[PDB]
């Protein structure tokens, strides 16, 4: 009884994007589908709702005409059609289910990230960072758009991981990660910073080696 | 101001009027509906033996009342004062069609 | 529409205490207000619906109290897992409005940072660029004013910092600072170092040493 | 218009000239009732009164039989489509004003 | 205010014939139309309520008809006690309205009048006035021109006539004409005649009186 | 016993107001609607208005614009018609009648009450005898005010042959003559008396028709 949100979209400014939300287990005909916009490091904004039987969903007047939610009962899925995109639209778009006024938005989808930028897709350039306990780093510079899945020693090194959030200078992204392992395990054991950019279909793996010359 | 609601059949929601001798009187979307406009159902109960709403005998109470929803109950509900004043609560029941 | 206001936009609290999130409405919303939890980069959970009533599978420590126009969510027992932002929302009239929200931070013992400085990798140096990274792995509270010197000189230009959220594992904060320079500029200057001041200052070093 | 006057225990057949309507009277009384026009009979597939009034039948515009009793004094409307009304005045001999 | 019109205001009919009183209404009366019979100076009776329905003790001869706007009253085998006016009356709406009426006259054979002239009594003459009376009795039809030639000379001045309604006995009208004069005038001229112009016979009916005093 | 007792005829000055009476015999007025009717001399009937005796407010025709106000008294089992600001257009006979409703009509009708609207004064008649095998003889009734005059012959015993002609108004005075046709054997043999009665002036004159 889950809500299947579509993969994150990178859209050029002014253009239109149609996002997807598929119902698992339950029948959409049995609830109202609601959509929510979440600006980066900001509050949620209710886009509008829809009774899947109607197929003429109600929207917030601040969004009226700009966003058009249309559901397909046959495929048991809803769609958010957003047009005339701006940088003010670069946000995460949640698709939720609701039983009514007196029940609220109960099941919330994972969220689809919409990046509104005239900038092009660029894979990252991973840079290893070698130096009691021992702290070690990994720098991921110059990638577009977000996100990047960063793991340590094929995710087997869960304890001691610290993944910092991405920083945009000018349509360029940069994030670094730090792992704290005992001075006994390094340089004895292999330590690989596993970086994954789904957007560019890359999965780069840079082994942290003790620096020399 | 205004109150706009959405529910589903088998649910029950409370309706009222801040602007208070009155009369509740709603109109429901004409398609697959016998009547085509605003229709009265309740009038304020006098000091006797009063009860019964005409097109929906499932509204319990003062005219600050609860409504059990089912087929066709989607429409705007008006509570009316002595002169002009009306408190309207819009309502939408899930899956309202043929 | 019915603008929703949450008196405070951040609330810090120690484990095993009771806290309250207040929400005032633009008009009487006849108890048609629900409460939401959004975990850091986690999903959004409906906590309380129609003021008081608990949502299925939501713990009892969560209490939804509410007057006609003034609503207040209360987390009675403080758990580390409760580090998340909470939102109120009205369903009374059709443009449903989501409030500002209140981030709930955890109060704990003041920890000193694990300051580690990293020199630019010989990989990045081929790309005609250089980047110095200074970390503060485990500390508390949130604010830490970093200042780093290269041979003593003050460098404020081209400095970009990044902070992680308070983990629900050890209840600590972490910060990353990146000093990006052109290959030539980093080759001209030697003995780069990062210092940190948190409530003697913690000073770290990374001299231009041969290897 | 139509203006009628009868006695309790009599019966008066009353109709319209309607355009599928609704009979809707208001009475100058309050035998458990209140002020305002109360619809008493509506068309459907076979018109019946159901539970507020229980003395009118239907001849089977539309024609009804009404057993006067005491307090049926009032104006009987025959509201059709788009304000296509057809009012009938009714007065029964007597003033029941004792509480 | 709904109006009621009877097509005729007077209807002459032979004994035992069939007659009808028609009534046209301005609105649909929906059978709420009643008939009334007001006898000459007699009481006014309710003949037939709610169109065809008859009032208790009303004879069968009376029949009520009509629907919608034009309603009728019908009387078979006519009687010498049916000489009265009949009124239509609506009750459909509250300004209850009556029809103009239709006087029912009974037809009969042409009767010549019993013309009788009377001199002013020596009673009236003391009061400084004089009156000549001429009674024309049991005649048919209704119209008869009176003529008062004082000593042959045409007198159109101060002549006042009076007719009685259709009698029950032999159903004949009677007329009375009074020529009022001042004591002196009557005492001035001798001859006083009284001529009836009725179509029973070839000639007019002439009566006379000549005053005798010397 | 269903009787509707109408009040005696009234002579009223123009502009003044008259309150006519109607009393109920046997039946309770609470059980019927009371209706009043106008009848102009030698003219049609005019419905004035009705009343539910259980209520104060009677409903009347717009032609009788606030002039006529029917008000019934249940306690005395009698109804009243008050007609104000009188004119010559009001000189008529006023009927009182009971009705059970729209589908029944006015079933019992009152005798009538004559109302005469005139500034003229009450005047007793001046009877004059009119003397001339069958013979005709009559009697004159000059200048009496107002109507009526009960004219009978030989103390009402001589019914057969009577002809009473209607009253003629002339400069506010009435004139009617009556004629009897008796066989020439009965006259001058028997006594013949023209009996005149004026209720209005409380006179009852009797003049023996004597051969002149
Ligand atoms: C409509 O009627 C109710 C009463 O309903 C009931 C009852 O007594 O609870 C419902 C029962 O199912 C029904 N049947 C049986 C077998 O008990 C009985 C039934 O009518 C009796 O048995 C017959 O004697 O009736 C109320 O009167 C209600 O009035 C409202 O009550 C409110 C209470 O908080 C408040 O006082 C309101 O002012 C008052 O109007 C009435 N409903 C409405 C909307 O008027
Ligand atoms: C009130 O009206 C009914 C008609 O009601 C019905 C119908 O058959 O038309 C009854 C159904 O239960 C109802 N269904 C529901 C659940 O609402 C349907 C209706 O068609 C649907 O709403 C829409 O399709 O309505 C009666 O006419 C009834 O009058 C009585 O009928 C009797 C028949 O044997 C008998 O003649 C009685 O004397 C007569 O009064 C009326 N109710 C009452 C109590 O008078």
Author numbering:
A (entry chain C): 21 to 151, 159 to 240
B (entry chain F): 19 to 38, 43 to 83, 91 to 127
C (entry chain D): 21 to 219, 223 to 234
D (entry chain E): 20 to 38, 43 to 83, 91 to 129
E (entry chain B): 21 to 234
F (entry chain A): 20 to 151, 159 to 238
Q: What do the study's own words say?
A:
G6b-B is a unique platelet ITIM-containing receptor that is highly expressed in mature MKs and platelets. The central tyrosine residues embedded in the consensus sequences of the ITIM ([I/V/L]xYxx[V/L]) and ITSM ([T]xYxx[V/I]) become phosphorylated by Src family kinases (SFKs) and subsequently act as docking sites for the Src homology 2 (SH2) domain-containing protein-tyrosine phosphatases (Shp)1 and 2.
The construct that was used was N32D, S67A, S68A, S69A, T71A. The solved complex encompasses six protein subunits, a dimer of G6b-B and two Fab fragments. Confirming the fold of the predicted model, the ectodomain of G6b-B forms an immunoglobulin-like fold of a topology closely resembling the structure of a variable immunoglobulin (Ig) domain. The ectodomain of G6b-B assembles into an apparent dimer with a pseudo two-fold symmetry oriented perpendicular to the extended β-sheet that forms the heparin binding site. Dimer formation of G6b-B is driven by the heparin ligand, as demonstrated by size exclusion chromatography. Nevertheless, dimerization creates a deep cleft, into which the heparin ligand inserts. Crystallization involved a dodeca-saccharide, of which eight residues are visible in the electron density map, with the central residues 4 and 5 representing sulfated L-iduronic acid (IDS) and D-glucosamine (SGN), respectively. Although the ligand-binding cleft provides partial charge complementarity to the sulfate groups of the heparin ligand, perhaps surprisingly, only one sulfate group (residue SGN5) forms ionic interactions with basic side-chains (SGN5-O2S – Arg60F-Nε 3.3 Å, SGN5-O3S– Lys109F-Nζ 3.2 Å, where the superscript refers to the chain ID). Among these four side-chains, the key interaction appears to be with Arg60, as Arg61 is shielded through G6b-B dimerization from the ligand, Lys54 is well separated from the binding cleft and Lys58 is situated within a 4 Å-radius of heparin, but makes no polar interactions.
